């Protein structure tokens, strides 16, 4: 560790805050809508294409109460989808030491959740040391009055 640290100092090492973001899920779940609203904080406005892959960049400022050591973080955002025929292909794009987010529709509920195992396994097969979040969309389609006892159950 001492030699690695001394090499970092000697080789004028800089702090890299850029990281990999991957968006995963079955077709028609709101991956692009997810990325859009998270980037902008507004209701979606963009009509997104049919391309299997969409690439962009995203900066996040630290929220109030954050104890982080960085003012902000940056993500080189990949979003892979498209026809299921290329699913076997898309498996190659998963890597380790990257952030994953799986997108699924809450309205389908358990029907979607079962399928999640497939996608989840596909990440752990090629990303043992990666953090993957899983997010349910279409929360507006869940009745607010029942919402808690629904979402917790689904969780």
Ligand X SMILES: Nc1nc2c(ncn2[C@@H]2O[C@H](COP(=O)(O)OP(=O)(O)O)[C@@H](O)[C@H]2O)c(=O)[nH]1
How many whole angstroms separate alpha carbon 113 and alpha carbon 118?
Answer: 10
Based on the shown chain and the rule CB under 6 A, indicate whether residue 24 belongs to the binding site for ligand X. no
Based on the shown chain and the rule CB under 6 A, indicate whether residue 33 belongs to the binding site for ligand X. yes
- Which residues inside 125-154 make contact with ligand X, applying CB under 6 A? 137-140
How many whole angstroms separate alpha carbon 149 and alpha carbon 62?
Answer: 31
Based on the shown chain and the rule CB under 6 A, indicate whether residue 48 belongs to the binding site for ligand X. yes
Per-residue contact string for residues 64-83; x = within reach of ligand X by CB under 6 A: -----------------x--
- Which residues inside 88-127 make contact with ligand X, applying CB under 6 A? none
Q: Which of 101, 96, 97 lies closest to 81, judged by CA? A: 101
Residue 98 C-beta: closest distance to ligand X, Å: 20
Based on the shown chain and the rule CB under 6 A, indicate whether residue 30 belongs to the binding site for ligand X. yes
Query: For ligand X, which residue of 31, 94, 104, 119 counts as binding (CB under 6 A)?
Result: 31
Residues 6 or more apart whose Cβ sits within 8 Å of residue 114 = none
């Amino acid at each position: 560790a001492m030699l690695s640290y001394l090499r970092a100092q000697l080789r004028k090492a800089e702090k890299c805050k850029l990281m990999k973001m991957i968006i995963v899920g079955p077709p028609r779940q709101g991956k692009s809508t997810l990325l859009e609203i998270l980037q902008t904080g507004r209701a979606p406005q963009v009509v997104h294409g049919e391309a299997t892959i969409r690439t962009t960049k995203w900066e996040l400022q630290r929220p109030a109460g954050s104890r982080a050591k960085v003012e902000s973080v940056e993500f080189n955002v990949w979003d892979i989808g498209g026809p299921a025929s290329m699913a076997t292909v898309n498996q190659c794009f998963f890597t380790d030491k990257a952030l994953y987010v799986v997108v699924w529709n809450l309205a389908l509920g358990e029907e979607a959740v079962a399928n999640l195992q497939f996608w989840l396994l596909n990440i752990e097969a090629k990303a043992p040391n990666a953090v993957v979040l899983v997010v349910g969309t279409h929360l507006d389609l869940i009745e607010a009055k029942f919402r808690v006892e629904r979402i917790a159950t689904l969780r």
